[PDB]
Design a binder for this molecule. Structure first.
Ligand code: SAM
Ligand code: ZN
Ligand code: ZN
Ligand code: ZN
Length: 213
């Protein structure tokens, strides 16, 4: 029962990273076929996508994934046993691959708290990641499919914080290759917000830490 958005909705804050990542220097290819910014390009080293208007690789680069909204067209929602809904791929996924950007209403730490008691009173799930400087990305009412990814103590994905054109945004990247049909997951510990609301983890894992978060 959420509203589908294609981009973050900035409520009362601004996640300005404060660092103008420019001149990624990594050289441009030669074949339209292949890509431009290998596993290098000085920018990707400080998790800062390249500003289109300067990247040596022109329109055919690969470190602007979050900007160009280059999400994977495979994710499929589905009923996860004792975890309600969940997301999974229909196409395999090499590791380190950009999977999708995590959207929502980016709000302050206090703006969220209020929502946490003023509206998310009688609520079961927890939809929001830590963004930066207390600012949070709330997705209880708005966001995309990522809001549907479950937690695992042995994640196959990691949420990463990148400076995009001067604004911190969060993308979901794979940690390990995955066979089609595999459910995407990430560790809510260093990413998801902090509310003493707790739940038993149906992670289904050997050394599972027992509790979410
Ligand atoms: C943002 S939602 C993920 C989508 C959700 N499964 C649904 O049906 O709408 C987060 C909630 O899903 C459930 N969940 C996600 N991962 C879980 C896990 N490993 N174990 C148990 N519950 C999980 C918990 O209620 C948690 O608060
Ligand atoms: Zn570069
Ligand atoms: Zn670039
Ligand atoms: Zn677990």
């Amino acid at each position: 029962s959420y509203k589908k958005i294609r981009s973050n909705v900035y409520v009362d804050v601004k996640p300005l990273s404060g660092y103008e990542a420019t001149t990624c220097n990594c050289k441009k290819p030669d074949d339209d076929t292949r890509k431009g910014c290998v596993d290098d390009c000085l920018n990707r080293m400080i998790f800062a996508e390249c500003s289109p208007n300067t990247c040596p690789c022109g329109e055919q680069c690969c470190n602007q994934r979050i900007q160009r909204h280059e999400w994977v067209q495979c994710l499929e929602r589905f009923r996860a046993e004792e975890k309600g809904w969940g997301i999974r791929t229909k196409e395999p996924l090499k590791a380190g691959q950009f999977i999708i950007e995590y959207l929502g209403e980016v709000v302050s730490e206090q703006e969220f708290r209020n929502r946490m008691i003023e509206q998310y009173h009688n609520h079961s799930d927890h939809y929001c990641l830590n963004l930066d400087s207390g600012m949070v990305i709330d997705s209880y009412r708005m966001g995309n499919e990522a809001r549907f990814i479950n937690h695992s103590c042995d994640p196959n994905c990691e949420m990463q914080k990148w400076s995009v054109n001067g604004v911190y945004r969060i993308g979901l990247y794979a940690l390990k290759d995955m066979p089609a049909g595999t459910e995407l997951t990430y560790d809510y510990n260093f990413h998801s917000f902090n509310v003493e609301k707790q739940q038993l983890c149906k992670c289904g894992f050997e050394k599972c830490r027992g509790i979410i978060g």
